């Protein structure tokens, strides 16, 4: 079977690896420039910038490379001025050979519990328009659609201001 649990500092290597795997699955692996050190400093200090749940499997089923972590979800809390606290699901991925065993479902169950405990009114998340399989996975679980134009201002300009 498997166990869903909060991430720990020692899971960052596995988390980074799964992040690159999902990005690759999204045809943009080259974009991942975050490192293990970043994940540790940003997720395991006094004030985390994100939170992760990971799926650990028994030794008999570790990956060929010898990895015990085969899935994860990264999230953090956001705020809507009209409704209040929201749980934001940032990244969600399960290794190919481990999909279809109920890991992603259990992860969503834990996420929902985190949401209710922190009294979030809803959970929001993005999905590549072409990623139909996942889309239907989410939809079958209450997922619904929700537009504007996302802009950004890099540190290059922020520093200026």
Ligand X SMILES: CC(C)(COP(=O)(O)OP(=O)(O)OC[C@H]1O[C@@H](n2cnc3c(N)ncnc32)[C@H](O)[C@@H]1OP(=O)(O)O)[C@@H](O)C(=O)NCCC(=O)NCCS
Is 76 part of the annotated catalytic residue set? no
Which of 3, 5, 116, 136 binds its own copies (CB under 8 A)? It is 116
Place of tokens 């399989």: 133
The string of DSSP codes covering 28-49 is -GGG----HHHHHHHHSSSS-S
Which of 85, 98, 99, 101 binds its own copies (CB under 8 A)? It is 85
Residue 85 touches which member of its own copies, ligand X, none, C-beta under 5-8 Å by kind? its own copies
Q: Of 88, 98, 138, 157, which residue is the catalytic one?
A: 138
Handedness of CA 105, 29, 69, 48 (dihedral sign): negative
**β-pair partners for 56:** 3, 69
Which of 3, 102, 109, 136 binds its own copies (CB under 8 A)? It is 109
DSSP 146: -
Residue 99 touches which member of ligand X, its own copies, none, C-beta under 5-8 Å by kind? ligand X
Which of 78, 105, 113, 121 binds ligand X (CB under 6 A)? It is 105
When asked if residue 143 is in the footprint of ligand X (CB under 6 A), the reply is no
For 108, counting Cβ atoms within 10 Å of its Cβ (0-12 exposed, 13-18 middle, 19+ buried), the class is buried
What string marks each residue from 25 to 54 as x (binds its own copies by CB under 8 A) or -? ---x--xxxx---x---x------xx----
Asked whether 40 and 9 are in contact (CB, 8 A), the reply is yes
Handedness of CA 81, 134, 33, 37 (dihedral sign): positive
Q: Rounded to whole angstroms, what are the CA distances from 2 to 12, 16, 78, 101, 124?
A: 19, 20, 29, 9, 26
User: Annotation-wise, does 122 bind a ligand?
Assistant: no
When asked if residue 51 is in the footprint of ligand X (CB under 6 A), the reply is no
What is the nearest approach in angstroms of its own copies to the Cβ of residue 102? Answer: 12
Question: C-alpha angle 92/94/100, rounded to 5°?
Answer: 120
Binding site for its own copies (CB under 8 A): 19, 22-23, 28, 31-34, 38, 42, 49-50, 74, 76-85, 87-88, 90-91, 108-109, 111-113, 115-116, 120-130, 135, 138, 141-161
């Amino acid at each position: 079977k498997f166990k869903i649990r909060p991430a720990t500092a020692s899971d960052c290597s596995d988390i980074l690896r799964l992040i690159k795997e999902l990005a690759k699955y999204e045809y943009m692996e080259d974009q991942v420039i975050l490192t293990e050190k970043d994940l540790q400093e940003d997720g395991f200090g006094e004030h985390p910038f994100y939170h992760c749940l990971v799926a650990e499997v028994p030794k008999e089923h570790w990956t060929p490379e010898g990895h015990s972590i085969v899935g994860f979800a990264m999230y953090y809390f956001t705020y809507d001025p009209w409704i209040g606290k929201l749980l934001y699901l940032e990244d969600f991925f399960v290794m190919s050979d481990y999909r279809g065993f109920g890991i992603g479902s259990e992860i969503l169950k834990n996420l929902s519990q985190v949401a209710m405990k922190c009294r979030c009114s809803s959970m929001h998340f993005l999905v590549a328009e072409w990623n139909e399989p996942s889309i239907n996975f989410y939809k079958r679980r209450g997922a619904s659609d929700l537009g504007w134009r996302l802009f950004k201002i890099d540190k290059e300009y922020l520093l200026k201001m």
